[PDB]
Design a protein around this ligand. Sequence first.
Ligand code: RZB
Ligand code: YB
Ligand code: YB
Ligand code: YB
Ligand code: ZN
Length: 607
Amino acid sequence: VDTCSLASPASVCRTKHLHLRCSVDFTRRTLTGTAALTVQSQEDNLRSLVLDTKDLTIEKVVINGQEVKYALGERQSYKGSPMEISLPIALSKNQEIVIEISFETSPKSSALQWLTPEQTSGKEHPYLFSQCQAIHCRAILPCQDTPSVKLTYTAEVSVPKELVALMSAIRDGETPDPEDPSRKIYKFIQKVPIPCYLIALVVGALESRQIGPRTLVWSEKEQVEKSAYEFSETESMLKIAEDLGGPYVWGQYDLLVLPPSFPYGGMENPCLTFVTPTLLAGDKSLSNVIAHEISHSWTGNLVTNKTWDHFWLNEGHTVYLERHICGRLFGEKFRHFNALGGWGELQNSVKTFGETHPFTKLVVDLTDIDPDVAYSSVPYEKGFALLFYLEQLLGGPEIFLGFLKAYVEKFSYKSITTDDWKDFLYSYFKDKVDVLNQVDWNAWLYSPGLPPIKPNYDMTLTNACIALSQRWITAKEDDLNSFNATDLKDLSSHQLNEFLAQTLQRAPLPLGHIKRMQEVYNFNAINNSEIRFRWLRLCIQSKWEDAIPLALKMATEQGRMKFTRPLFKDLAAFDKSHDQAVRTYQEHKASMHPVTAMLVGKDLKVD
Ligand SMILES: N[C@H](CC(=O)O)Cn1nnc(-c2ccc(Oc3ccc(Cl)cc3)cc2)n1
Ligand SMILES: [Yb+3]
Ligand SMILES: [Yb+3]
Ligand SMILES: [Yb+3]
Ligand SMILES: [Zn+2]
C-alpha cells in the first residue's frame, strides 16, 4: 500500500498517459491549463476514482466532451487533498478513458520555485523550475502521485517568447502561440513510461552547448562555458554506464545547470538531468554527482521503488553503479576510497538521528511522515553498504555486476519492493543460497543503526587523510608550528575533503588549532563547495567568530540543502551567531525554495 498517496491505487486504475497543455504565467506565479489523463480501469464496474492534488484550483473535469461531478476532500497536511471524480459510465476491466482536468497551481506550490529577474544570473528575465520528488507532482497537477504507476507523456507549454521551456522529455518543436504572439509554445514527448515524480519543467533565459554526441548542457548564458568544461566527462560516463546496465533507452542525455537555490545536488529527470551550480568547482572534481544521475537512467528510472518505503532500492543500487563508473575511470583504489567515505557519511547520519531512530532502518515506514523530513544519507549509504557487503560475500565486483545487469533487465519499466529484489537476488544466486542464508536479513533491512557487518575497504588513499587528521586532533599548542602548506602537497581535492570530514567527526577542535589551519593551509580561499562547506562547519563548531559572515554567506548565496541545512543548524548552535542565523532565515524565507524554507524553519525551530 502507498501510504503517501490519497489516490486510487494501481490495483483499481492506472494512468497510462498524460497530455499536458499549460501556460506559465509569471505575473500571477501560476501554471494554468489542462491535464488529460488516459486511465485504464483494473476492476469491473468502476464508477469513480480518486486523484492526488495539493493547493490546486480545479475549474472543471471533462469526460466524453461533458462536464462531470468531482469533489475535493478535506486537506491531509503534506499529502494534500483527495479529488474524487464520478465517471459518466461504468468501466469494465482494461477499459480506458480520457479525463481532462482544467486546473491552476498555487503560487505557493511546494513543487515549484518562482524566481524574480534579480535572483537569476542575467538579471533581465524571471525563471521557474519544478522538483516533484517525492510527492510534489500533486502540487502541479491532479495525478495518481505514486511511483507504483508508470505513464508516458506529451506536453505543450506556452511561455513568454523571450524564454525557453525544457521538460523531462524529448524536445518536439516550438511555434509562436496562436492565441498570443507575445508567447511561444514548446512541445515535448516522453515515450518511455515513467513514475510521475520524474515529470519536470524549467522555464528561463536558457542557452545550450553541445558537449557530446547525445548531450547538450543548458544554463543561463553566464554559466554555459564553465558548465561545458565541468561536465565534459559525461559521454565517457554514459558509455561505462551502458556497459554496466545495458542499453540507454532515453534517447538524449542533456544537463541543466539550475540557479543556486536548486535544493539538491541533482535530479535524475529523464532526458534532462538537473544539477546544482555548486558542482562548478573548475576542475571536474564533483563529477561523481553526474555519474550518480546518469546511473539513475537504469536504477530508479527503469527499475523504480513501488512505494517510498522501498526508496533504498533506488538509491542503494544507484550509488553502487555510480561508484563502479568512477572506479572504471579512476581505478579500483578510488572506488574503495569513495565507498569508505560513504560509510563515514552513514556514521554521521546514524549519530545525528540516533542509533535506534526509525529513519536509520533500510526499509522505512512513512505512514504519517513527510518524505522530505525523512530525507537523509541512510537509504543511499546503508543501501550501498548492503550491496558492497553482498559483492564481497558473493565473489567480487565482476560477479555482482552480472547480478546488477540481470536485475535491470528483469525489472525494467516496473515498480518493485524489497521482497521482489530479495527474491530475484536468491533466484540469480541459486548456487550460493547457503552464503545468502548467512546474511542477517532482519538486521540489514529492518533494524535501526549501523549495519551488523562493516565491509572490507582498501585503505590506500584514505591513510594520508587519517594520518593528517590524527596529527591535528592529537596536536598540543607546542605542536602547531610543525604544520605547513607542504602537508597538503600530495593530497587530491578528494583527499583534502576526506581530511576535513575525518576532522569534523571529532569537532570541536581548540580555536587555536583552527586559526593555525587557516594560517598554514588557507582553506578560506578554496571555492570547492564540498571542501568549503566542511571547513566552515569545522570553524563554526570550533567557535571561530570570524567564520560567521562566511558561513551565513554560503548558507544564503546557494540553497543546496546538503549545505544550507547544516550551516544554519551549526550557526544556530553557536551562541555568537544564533540571533544572526534566525534573522537571516527570517529575511530570506519569502525568497527561498518552499521545501528548503520549510526544513530550515523546522531545524531552527522558527515557525
Ligand atoms: N533524486 C535526486 C538526485 C539524487 O538522489 O542523486 C535527489 N533528490 N531530490 N529529491 C529527493 C527526495 C528523495 C526522497 C524523498 O523522500 C524520501 C526520503 C527518504 C526515504 Cl527512506 C523515502 C522517501 C524526498 C526527496 N531526492
Ligand atoms: Yb517530432
Ligand atoms: Yb524465492
Ligand atoms: Yb608538547
Ligand atoms: Zn540518487
